[PDB]
Design a binder for this molecule. Sequence first.
Ligand SMILES: N=C(NCCCN(CCNC(=O)NCc1ccccc1)C[C@H]1O[C@@H](n2cnc3c(N)ncnc32)[C@H](O)[C@@H]1O)Nc1cccc(Br)c1
Ligand SMILES: N=C(NCCCN(CCNC(=O)NCc1ccccc1)C[C@H]1O[C@@H](n2cnc3c(N)ncnc32)[C@H](O)[C@@H]1O)Nc1cccc(Br)c1
Lengths: 328, 328
Amino acid sequence: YFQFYGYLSQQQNMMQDYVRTGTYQRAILQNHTDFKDKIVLDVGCGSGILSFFAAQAGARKIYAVEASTMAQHAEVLVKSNNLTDRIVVIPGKVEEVSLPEQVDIIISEPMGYMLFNERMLESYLHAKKYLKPSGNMFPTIGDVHLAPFTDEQLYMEQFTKANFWYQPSFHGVDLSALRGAAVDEYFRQPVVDTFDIRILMAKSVKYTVNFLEAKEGDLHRIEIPFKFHMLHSGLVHGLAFWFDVAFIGSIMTVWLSTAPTEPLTHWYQVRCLFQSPLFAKAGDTLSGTCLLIANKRQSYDISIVAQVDQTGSKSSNLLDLKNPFFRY
Amino acid sequence: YFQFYGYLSQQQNMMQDYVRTGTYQRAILQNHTDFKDKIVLDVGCGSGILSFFAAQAGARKIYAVEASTMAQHAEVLVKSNNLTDRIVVIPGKVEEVSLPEQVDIIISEPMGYMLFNERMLESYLHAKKYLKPSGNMFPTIGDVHLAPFTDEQLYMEQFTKANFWYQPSFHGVDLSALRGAAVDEYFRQPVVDTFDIRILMAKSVKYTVNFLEAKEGDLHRIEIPFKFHMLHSGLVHGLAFWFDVAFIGSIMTVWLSTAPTEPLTHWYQVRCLFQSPLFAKAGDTLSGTCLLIANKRQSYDISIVAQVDQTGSKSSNLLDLKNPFFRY
Ligand SMILES: N=C(NCCCN(CCNC(=O)NCc1ccccc1)C[C@H]1O[C@@H](n2cnc3c(N)ncnc32)[C@H](O)[C@@H]1O)Nc1cccc(Br)c1
Ligand SMILES: N=C(NCCCN(CCNC(=O)NCc1ccccc1)C[C@H]1O[C@@H](n2cnc3c(N)ncnc32)[C@H](O)[C@@H]1O)Nc1cccc(Br)c1
């Protein structure tokens, strides 16, 4: 996490998501009266682009904190765009460094897959110790959406991928006894890619984090109960996840959405299969709990439990977000 | 390294390289008199396949040591192929575990990209403390080959990939001052893929490690001097690397080659660009040194220095094998 982020090729890959770059620039500059003559903290600034957007909006002073060697590249951009007076790059972790001054506004891009992955939100919330009571954060809130999906093609792919392990004589070795463990491992990988909304079987449930109010420790254990009103009849193969963040400015509220009804981002969307699918009729209710537990690997364990109330038919899975399947 | 190797999907990907699996089975079974009634150590056994090949050749007892959770999957295959008496799976690092007995023969697949990557050879050599003076190792020796190449398409690609950083106004930001650092980072990535032998400008130099004699500490610092006799006139853009291992049995010597004149393996071949190319005439000599320094990340820093003796024109690079470009 503090070596992968030191690569310009990584910063270049992320800056080429036009929705990400354009949405941040629009959020900041449409709300430019919220930056004019203010003090700004940029948390995990990377190449420094958000610090430049703050400068474009007339900020007085911007502290740009970056834990990786990307910080050295940022101080090169600040010197070459003639801004050393106004943008101060501070190499180090936002938890350990010193700021000479409290700030009017914190800006960051801390969203991983499914919003929480990489656990950079913990660092964004930690930075609030530097924020005046007056103060705002950009982004301001995050909504995670969950909905059940039906996708027999994706379900069956997990069996197909393991059918290597069926071989009773792979060079004289019987592999067959491991086929079930292989299936099982594939099912524990969250699937990162996009899909058509035609697969959703119910309207999404929304879980909101208010970054103005939430505290670092809220994200160690995230509990998301759901009740879906099934709009279609068939097999539910798992839950689909996406997120939206809102930049709530004085002038305007700007949304960055990773929803499958919006243009593609490099966040795609994430699907977690159940170990075995549930039959539900239109009219039935599908209820359960999604639990995200933060792990030492800077990711989450995802526990999902769902039952159809009308039948009592129940399914679950425990997925490792450290190990996604990038199907796109 | 002790989590990535715990995945069946990784074991499955490696077992599907037909040259790798077929070559190991042929080496062991053509030399079956070297295993018949013997004691065998399988170092980093993975799924356990080499332990089964030892059993196929009549070994008496095989200790199969594996540091990852793949060990639990191996004990499932041993029980299901009816071999618990003959193959003993030992979960843990070959450096820390106990064997009740010295062995006639050590078998392993410890070769990373460019042979040394992942530094598993250090563990293979460490295991020799368990080997009788009688004893053999499979594989027995490794040859690394280096040769100079000419590939203007690959050279120019490194500039093209960085031309994102030329933008004087990326959303009002001048990126141009970082273009040189970006070029530079691309040039420090070893290129993993295959190429036509038509690009080689001289016959390869061979550096041999004799695993029977070499000691763990020989691989901390590997020094490979070279003198090439240029067979073609043009720009030399860098050095190409590949390796061969030999299974030197009583009955036969079997070769596993990753050479560009042999069928493709999932080792491909590796090319390191010079920061700037050297002009050489057919008849000139290209001399220098390739130095591999082992790092904390279980990989190597690659320093390359070359000059054309006839002109004194000199080039270098320092590459990080932890960060390859997978161009295939
Ligand atoms: N993965 C994403 N974001 C998570 C954060 C990534 N990164 C944001 C980079 N910032 C930028 O690009 N800013 C420029 C930008 C932003 C938005 C639009 C345009 C440009 C986090 C940054 O914090 C750094 N750091 C880590 N821990 C820290 C600590 N404790 N203290 C201080 N710094 C710390 C770490 O080195 C790194 O530089 N985005 C993502 C993922 C998938 C797809 C897509 Br497209 C986007
Ligand atoms: N990358 C390669 N090899 C490097 C070694 C990988 N692996 C070989 C797996 N072994 C097998 O597949 N064996 C089966 C096999 C072998 C050959 C042919 C067919 C099947 C090393 C194994 O040691 C384990 N371990 C690590 N440190 C250890 C320590 N100190 N002590 C004990 N175990 C330790 C670690 O968990 C892991 O299981 N091969 C590779 C690379 C690119 C392309 C291709 Br195709 C192949």
